[model samples]
Target: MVLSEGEWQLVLHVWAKVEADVAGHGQDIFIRLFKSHPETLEKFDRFKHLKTEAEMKASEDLKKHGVTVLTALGAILKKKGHHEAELKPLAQSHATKHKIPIKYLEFISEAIIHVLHSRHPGNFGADAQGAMNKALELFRKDIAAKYKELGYQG
Candidate 1:
């Protein structure tokens, strides 16, 4: 699931565009995730009470969480595999403490795809979309492997 040099450039362009509005785009992503998989919201004590998209939109907590999420994603975007160092500890926390369902990673990925595609259809063309998806798939596998190592049922 490696992105070719050309594909990485295309994907980075999309990220660069979104960097200008990280909070707004990240909020949209989390909202889409909750909408697509309502159960995931229950895991977020800070955001669970936000039952509607409008309610979520109004919450600063949601915006804050969204910002952190996008920041992690930016780290994951690099081709040198730096995210591997980050995911082990993240996976440990989720598995042992947060009890995060492994599938939530995929849910976030889907929401990201939906938001980028919907917000910028022209920029998130097939090439860009495919590269990003490939990158995220690699992320999911790494985190899920950590979860398994920790014996996390989720």
Candidate 2:
């Protein structure tokens, strides 16, 4: 899914706004994820006991993780497709240490897209949504490839 230069810019532009509201935006994403994919909640020990959005939001661990994910995305965007240097290690760690299945990582994108659609209804139309979908898809593709390289099937 190669995004055109314009589409890439659009993704970066929307990401700037999303990045500005990092904590709130991240929280919204997780809220949607837990709501839509309750099974995902059980994967995270820190988040497993927490059900409501407020409970998750109140946890420092959740906030830190939210920022971590967003920050990683920002780094990837900044380096263009040159993010392999940063992504491979994290992907390896996630596949090995975290034992996160590829499906769960893919679902994170689903939650992010939901957040974009619901949180900025007027601003996020076809183009923005398309760009985000492409960007995240590329990210997932790269991570999945890295997982395979590290002998991880999931």
Candidate 3:
């Protein structure tokens, strides 16, 4: 079963916030992210364990650049909902820059599973789904406020 289109888009935006929170926490955060969205692992080669120096370097680079990339992307996503025509350029540019496949966006619903299961573990029953929903809500609120501090219009 897949998440609806609306949910998937929210997951994509939430990924940025999750990455920010998880950046310095260690590889387990990523493991949780990828394990939640295994399909994304296939789309981006950088989703590896990152135990080596080279992988760690790339991970750090992504995090540094990710702050900008993800924040801008989140704002754009908030302004523009998911419509193939609307998102094509986004997909193309993201793919070109990150080397991730455009088609993988379809699997973004997996992100919620990752967030919930990782956060709640054995207690990840129906209630954890609520946590995921709340998590996304709080994340967007935070993202928008951060942008607002920079003089965002909305």
How well does candidate 2 match the true structure in TM-score terms? 0.92
Global lDDT for candidate 1?
0.84
Candidate 2 vs candidate 3: the lDDT winner is: 2
Error of 3 at 37 (Å): 7.8
Across 17-43, the per-residue lDDT of candidate 1 in tens digits comes to: 889999999899988899989999888
Name model 2 segments beyond 4 Å from true.
none
Error of 3 at 120 (Å): 7.5
lDDT score, candidate 1, position 149 = 86
lDDT of 3 by residue, 125-150 (tens): 55445544544444344434333443
Question: Residue 95 in model 3: shift from native, Å?
Answer: 5.2
Cα error, residue 110 of model 2, in Å, equals 0.9
Model 3: lDDT of residue 11: 48
Alpha carbon lDDT at 39, candidate 1: 92
Cα TM-score of candidate 3: 0.37
Q: In every candidate, how many clashes are there?
A: 0, 0, 0
lDDT of each: 0.84, 0.83, 0.46
Off by over 4 Å in 1: none
- Give lDDT tens digits, candidate 2, residues 50-131: 9687787788888878888888888887666668899987998888988888899788889988888887767678988888
